[PDB]
Design a binder for this molecule. Structure first.
Ligand SMILES: O=P(O)(O)[C@@H](CCCc1cccc(Oc2ccccc2)c1)S(=O)(=O)O
Ligand SMILES: [Mg+2]
Length: 324
């Protein structure tokens, strides 16, 4: 139908690099995961728009899931760039309602909980590392949780896929953290902060000081510390994919992880993270594994003894080598 063509039209307008893997999914997953994406995309577009006042935003975010069953609803007052998905929501929420009930449930659930969770972190920055996980859990982990419950609901994946929330969480925590990390300049010049204060704060006195070239030294030290943090998810990742049994689902999951891993390798001990831009076989686990193990070595081979988190980086690479 024509509202569907529009939905995949939006999927491509907005998704930098999922478009292809989503449209390649087998069966009812395709559309389940296309609409799922568009819904969360709408939700985020709201969260990120800083022209929307907090008192106006918290309600939107909270009640957003409910808008899924309000055919006529839409948001016209947005100034963010992906704002078509909101101005023309009714179309999305319509295809949502054509989704099979078993899929609407998962979607509207994760939608409902992301909402109460994004509105949570509007007031405050991300202070500690337990919080960084928490915020990454909300925006990203739940997507990881949610997708895998769609997978199993589709019957294209085992029940054991969607039962495993701890590792589905990890899949997203990892992806999300590498993005937070890479995005440091983009986030800081769009006036946002997601680097964990109790981390960055003991290299510098305010976060923006990393955009200063008189500070790059300490900047990379913070960058590596966080990378090492992010690397700690790579085992759960390897465990999660090792369980998948559908090529379409598998490529959907592997690719972005492998690509998250490349980004993290490109950024390690790398000035350009704070200067400009960072330029950078994955279709069976043991290929995927080999590929992961490879990038790990690159990290390893550039850990300077001086860097105050050398032992940790090596420490967690050594565990990834000899795990599973
Ligand atoms: O929360 P952030 O860091 O701003 C990030 C949006 C993350 C929330 C989100 C939106 C849309 C899709 C999404 O995850 C999916 C969901 C379904 C299919 C593929 C990916 C997660 S964004 O960089 O894309 O804005
Ligand atoms: Mg956001």
């Amino acid at each position: 139908s024509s509202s569907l063509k529009t939905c995949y039209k939006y999927l491509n307008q907005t998704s930098r690099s999922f478009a292809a893997v989503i449209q390649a999914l087998d069966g009812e997953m395709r559309n389940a995961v296309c609409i799922f994406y568009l819904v969360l995309r709408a939700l985020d577009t709201l969260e990120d728009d800083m022209t929307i006042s907090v008192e106006k935003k918290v309600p939107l975010l909270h009640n957003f899931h409910s808008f899924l069953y309000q055919p006529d609803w839409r948001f016209m007052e947005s100034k963010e760039k992906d704002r078509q998905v909101l101005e023309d929501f009714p179309t999305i929420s319509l295809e949502f309602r054509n989704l099979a009930e078993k899929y609407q449930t998962v979607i509207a659930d994760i939608c409902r909980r992301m909402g109460i969770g994004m509105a949570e972190f509007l007031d405050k920055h991300v202070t500690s590392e337990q919080e960084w996980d928490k915020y990454c859990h909300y925006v990203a982990g739940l997507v990881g949780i949610g997708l895998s419950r769609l997978f199993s609901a589709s019957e294209f994946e085992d029940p054991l896929v969607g039962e495993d929330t701890e590792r589905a969480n990890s899949m997203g925590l990892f992806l999300q953290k590498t993005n937070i990390i890479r995005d440091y300049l983009e986030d800081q010049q769009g006036g946002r902060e997601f680097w964990p204060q109790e981390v960055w704060s003991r290299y510098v006195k305010k976060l923006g000081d990393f955009a200063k070239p008189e500070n790059i030294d300490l900047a990379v030290q913070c960058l590596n510390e966080l990378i090492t943090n992010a690397l700690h998810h790579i085992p759960d990742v390897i465990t999660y994919l090792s369980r998948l049994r559908n090529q379409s689902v598998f490529n959907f999951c592997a690719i972005p992880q492998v690509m998250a891993i490349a980004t993290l390798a490109a950024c390690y001990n790398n000035q350009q993270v704070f200067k400009g831009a960072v330029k950078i076989d994955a279709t069976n686990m043991p290929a995927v594994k080999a590929i992961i193990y490879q990038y790990m070595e690159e990290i390893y081979h550039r850990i300077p003894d001086s860097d105050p988190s050398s032992s940790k980086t090596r420490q967690i690479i050594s565990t990834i080598r000899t795990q599973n």
